[PDB]
Amino acid sequence: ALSEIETRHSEIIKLENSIRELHDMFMDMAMLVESQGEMIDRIEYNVEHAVDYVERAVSDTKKAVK
Amino acid sequence: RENEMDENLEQVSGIIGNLRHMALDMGNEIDTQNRQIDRIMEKADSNKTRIDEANQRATKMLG
Amino acid sequence: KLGKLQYSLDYDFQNNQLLVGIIQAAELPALDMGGTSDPYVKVFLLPDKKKKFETKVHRKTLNPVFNEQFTFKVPYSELGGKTLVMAVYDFDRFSKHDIIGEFKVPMNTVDFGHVTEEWRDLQSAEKEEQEKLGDICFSLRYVPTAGKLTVVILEAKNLKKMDVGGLSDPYVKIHLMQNGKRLKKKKTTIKKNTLNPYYNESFSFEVPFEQIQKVQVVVTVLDYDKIGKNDAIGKVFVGYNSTGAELRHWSDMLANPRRPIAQWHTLQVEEEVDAMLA
Amino acid sequence: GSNRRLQQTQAQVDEVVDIMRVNVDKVLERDQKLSELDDRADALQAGASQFETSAAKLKRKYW
Amino acid sequence: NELEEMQRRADQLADESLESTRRMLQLVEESKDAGIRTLVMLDEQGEQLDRVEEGMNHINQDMKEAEKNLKDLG
Ligand SMILES: [Ca+2]
Ligand SMILES: [Ca+2]
Ligand SMILES: [Ca+2]
Ligand SMILES: [Ca+2]
Ligand SMILES: [Ca+2]
Ligand SMILES: [Ca+2]
């Protein structure tokens, strides 16, 4: 029947649309993870510089009470 | 062909299952790292406080 | 080069069948015995794995006369996605029948409207590259400071079938080797019944930056058998004596410290991989 | 079954859609926390630099 | 009548469903690779966050020591 093949085809196309939604969702996920990654890199840079400054300050304070 | 169609359906189904496993592991990892970011940010606030107080005292000791 | 083949081609729209004509070949090489060849032609359709038809064997001739015709029960609409393959072979009684030369004609380029008949120079066919075994993707992360090597087994695809009547029961075993000695044996979980397994399992090793160029990591994808020793599907190895994409990924890991690098790798037979390890 | 394969695959697909949606929202929260952590980090290295300068002053003065 | 056209419509919808399945396979494959890259990046950023936390702890220790020094000077 044309009704059966067309409804079958309909379920198929619906499955394709759902899969497209999942696809866009996964790619979006990858994108966000990348962005978060670079921002995390920035955070790490700030943290390392902070480690340096703190370390210097600690050496200075420790040497000042000597 | 109907055979190629159904076979494609099967392959797609399996790959989808793989995507499920990936999604779950991903989710757990994201949660753990969220908790991690929370802890790190708390430590960040504590260290912010310590640096501000120590710097305030330091500048006050000038003279 | 080194040969010509006269072929005919026509489609019977009434019976919906393909008419392939094998008339005569010319300018054939002097194999096997000195003088003239013993030729016979195997003709078949692609991608059909159907029974390959073959013409009569002709005793001692470089200019053979077949004058035979073959019929292929093929729908016309499906014919556009097919390709006619004609392969000329040399008959050998006590040896493997060496292929003289084959060529292929795309059926979506053939005008079945008029009776087709053409001479075509035989082409030296391509040779299958061993057998497909499969690919495996994983990530490599190395931190020289702590000497920690993070190898995260990600996944695999197109793995060869082992188990009879079934697909596979794939699992990944990691061998950390040096000087032909197996030092560390780490293995992943078993994903039952799959040709596209997913793991995402992280592993870590102690690798000093002084020996980073003297260590070899052998990844082996095997199939789990319920009873008996589990047969190995394939394996690849990186590090020392590494080649191609392996040395590429290794060098990428070295050039990118404190960072994981994901990459695919084509599996090779266990024999050759074990052989490449000096 | 023929229709059954479609229904099954569809079900798996929708499931992964739900799970991945949740994971995406979790990555959004992660993103907020990462932003806040970024600002806090920059401010922290700023304050650490200033405290380093102050420590330099007090050291040069008191030692 | 429209019998022939009906049959050709059936084959047309069949082919449409077939190519649909093809598109499905391509899409799920691209989604798959996207997810893999996602996981890898999450590993990188994760270890990075671990290192950031360790750094924060070291900062806390050092700053506590400096705090002790300032309490000594006080
Ligand atoms: Ca011969
Ligand atoms: Ca011969
Ligand atoms: Ca087996
Ligand atoms: Ca097995
Ligand atoms: Ca982590
Ligand atoms: Ca930790």
Numbering used by the authors:
A (entry chain B): 191 to 256
B (entry chain D): 142 to 204
C (entry chain E): 141 to 418
D (entry chain A): 27 to 89
E (entry chain C): 9 to 82
Which sentences did the original study use to describe this structure?
We subsequently successfully applied our methods to the previously unknown crystal structure of the complex between synaptotagmin-1 (Syt1) and the neuronal SNARE complex, which mediates the fusion of synaptic vesicles with the synaptic membrane and is essential for Ca2+-dependent neurotransmitter release. The Syt1–SNARE complex crystallizes in two distinct crystal forms with morphologies that were indistinguishable by inspection of the crystals.
Here we have measured a synchrotron data set from a similar crystal in the same long unit cell' crystal form used for the XFEL-data derived structure. Synchrotron data were collected using the shutterless, continuous rotation method at the Northeastern Collaborative Access Team (NE-CAT) beamline at the Advanced Photon Source at Argonne National Lab on a Pilatus 6M detector (Dectris). Each of the three data sets contained 150 diffraction images in 0.2° frames and an exposure time of 0.2 s. The synchrotron diffraction data were obtained from a single crystal judged to be the best from a pool screened for optimal diffraction, and 4.1 Å was determined to be the maximum achievable limiting resolution with this particular data set.
